[PDB]
Amino acid sequence: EHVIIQAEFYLNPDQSGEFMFDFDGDEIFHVDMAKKETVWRLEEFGRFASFEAQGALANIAVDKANLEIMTKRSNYTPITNVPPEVTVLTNSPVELREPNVLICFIDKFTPPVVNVTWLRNGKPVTTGVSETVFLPREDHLFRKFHYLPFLPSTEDVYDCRVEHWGLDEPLLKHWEFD
Amino acid sequence: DTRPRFLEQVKHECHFFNGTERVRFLDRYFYHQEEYVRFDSDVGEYRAVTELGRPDAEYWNSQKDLLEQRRAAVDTYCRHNYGVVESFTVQRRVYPEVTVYPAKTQPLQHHNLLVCSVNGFYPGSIEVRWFRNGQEEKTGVVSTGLIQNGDWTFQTLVMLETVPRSGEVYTCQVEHPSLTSPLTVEWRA
Amino acid sequence: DIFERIASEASRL
Ligand SMILES: *[C@@H]1O[C@H](CO)[C@@H](O)[C@H](O)[C@H]1NC(C)=O
């Protein structure tokens, strides 16, 4: 069994839309809606296939139109915030001074709006960070990954700081060399 | 920001059983998390999932042209996209790197945990077993479970609670579709 | 080798 899903969403009042394809829980690509460009999750995908990103904008336009209808149909019943679970891990066993990657896994939340900051020794770090778009879950909440390549040392500690409207205070998830 | 939020979601799902031998298309519409109407190729018409979706099922089911587009999707959409992606998704195979390192359940004195770290593999189905002197060790095994890295790789740690003694040979054994025979890594006190 | 998207269905006002 395999499953391919074309997942879309549109969110008011933020007016943010998303369009992506998922294979068995992994993102094949998404459409950068502002640039109207296909963003392949692995570079090698773009050499094997193509996708006319322009047509994702038509789907989002229908979804925005449907959202206005459903919002009214529901008597303006808003979404209930579901705050995320957050886990910090590395993608390989940690060796001192051997380059590695910190993964911040943000799971089981909605709406798909989140602020994520990597902290090193309590200070925000942005050099080399990357992230995924919001990924759909089978229970129709969302998940997301943020990444920080790093050089493991004994003198550095790290936190992934997540802010979400369902959280009372920011959620800080710690990592340090054992 | 406390302004109320409203979310629409659509999931156009293609389900494949034995490649493209059997294919099911599911067109699903959601308001926040509530699926309210769907098209199931098993039915060939939209059905309301909740009362919220009844106006759409009635309206869309009245448009034969719309329905025939959905009825064709298993062929024009699902089987087509399966052909496009199958070689680097269905057939993607990345074998695991396997590392065995010792650890401590709590700060003790002696390592009392043997970690079998299995990294970078695809797809997710994997079997990891611990052996001591060639007999499988089934007691005191604990794991992270299967972890998605979000980049088309998985990892898992499988830990054996044991006090290692000299003269013992410990083996982590990994079975995975990318491997043609079990990957084994040994560890000795 | 071209990905096909499927349209989302439009509700009526
Ligand atoms: C909205 O209000 C109308 C009028 O009271 C009612 O008939 C309808 O069931 C309500 N719908 C929802 C989803 O609350």
> What CATH number does residue B28 fall under?
3.10.320.10
Q: State whether A78 and B87 contact (CB < 8 Å).
A: no
| Shared domain check, B171 and B133 | yes
Beta carbon of A76 within 6 Å of any ligand 1 atom: no
**Chain A hits for C11, Cβ within 8 Å:** 65-66, 69-70
E-only strand ranges, chain A:
2-12, 16-23, 26-32, 37-40, 85-90, 100-109, 115-120, 123-125, 130-131, 135-136, 142-150, 157-163, 171-176
How far B46 CA sits from the closest chain C CA (Å)? 11
**Chain C hits for B39, Cβ within 8 Å:** 9
CA of A141 to the centre of ligand 1 (A): 25
B161 class by beta-carbon count within 10 Å (0-12 exposed, 13-18 middle, 19+ buried): middle
Residue carrying the six token digits 């943000």: A106
Of the candidates C2, C6, C12, the beta carbon closest to that of B84 is on C2
DSSP A168: S
By the 8 A CB rule, do B173 and B187 touch? no
By the 8 A CB rule, do B105 and B159 touch? no
By the 8 A CB rule, do B137 and B159 touch? no
What's B108's domain CATH number? 2.60.40.10
Pairing of β A142-150 and β A135-136: antiparallel
How far B24 CA sits from the closest chain A CA (Å)? 10
| Shared domain check, B84 and B7 | yes
Among candidates C12, B141, B131, which has minimal Cα distance to A72? C12
| Cβ within 8 Å of residue A81, ≥6 positions away | A110, A111, A164, A165, A166, B5
How far A87 CA sits from the closest chain C CA (Å)? 33
Of the candidates A56, A62, A70, the beta carbon closest to that of C10 is on A62
Amino acid identity for residue B16 in this structure: F
| Shared domain check, B103 and B116 | yes
What residues make up the domain containing B18?
A: 1-90
- Could you tell me the resolution of this structure in angstroms? 2.1
By the 8 A CB rule, do B37 and B59 touch? no
CA angle B47, B51, B55 (to 5 degrees): 65
For A31, half-sphere exposure in the C-beta direction (CA atoms, 13 angstrom radius) is: 26
Q: Which of B41, B61, B90 is the last residue of a domain?
A: B90
Beta carbon of A72 within 6 Å of any ligand 1 atom: no
| Shared domain check, B139 and B64 | no
Bridge partners for A70 per DSSP: none
DSSP H or E run through B99: strand B97-103
Residue A60 DSSP SS3: helix
Q: Does B63 touch chain C if contact means CB atoms closer than 8 Å?
A: no
Residue B131 DSSP SS3: strand
Beta carbon of A154 within 6 Å of any ligand 1 atom: no
Question: How many beta-carbon contacts under 8 Å exist across A and C?
Answer: 36
| Shared domain check, B68 and B104 | no
Other beta carbons within 10 angstroms of residue A126's beta carbon come to: 8
- Dist. CA A10–CA B9, nearest whole Å: 7
By the 8 A CB rule, do B163 and B80 touch? no
At B59, list the tokens. 């309206």
DSSP H or E run through B173: strand B169-175
**Chain C hits for B73, Cβ within 8 Å:** 6
| Shared domain check, B105 and B41 | no
> Domain tally for chain B?
2
Domain A79-178 sits in which CATH superfamily? Immunoglobulins (2.60.40.10)
| Shared domain check, B180 and B98 | yes
Q: How many residues are listed for chain C in this entry? A: 13
| Shared domain check, B97 and B164 | yes
Contacts of A20-25 spanning 24+ positions with Cβ under 8 A: A20/A133, A20/A135, A20/A136, A21/A51, A21/C3, A22/A135, A22/A136, A23/B85, A23/B89, A24/B89, A24/B123, A24/B124, A25/B148
- Dist. CA A112–CA A146, nearest whole Å: 14
At A89, list the tokens. 């891990």
- Dist. CA A160–CA A172, nearest whole Å: 6
Would you state the CATH architecture of domain A1-78? Roll (3.10)
Give the start-to-end residue ranges of the domains of chain A: 1-78, 79-178
CA A54 from centre of chain: 22
Q: Does A44 touch chain C if contact means CB atoms closer than 8 Å?
A: no
Residue A72 DSSP SS3: helix
Q: Which of B74, B90, B106 is the last residue of a domain?
A: B90
Q: How far apart are the first and last CA of chain B?
A: 57
Residue carrying the six token digits 């060790």: B137
| Shared domain check, B121 and B86 | no
| Shared domain check, B137 and B54 | no
| Shared domain check, B68 and B111 | no
At A155, list the tokens. 């003198």
| Shared domain check, B102 and B131 | yes
Q: How far apart are the first and last CA of chain A?
A: 40
Amino acid identity for residue B94 in this structure: V
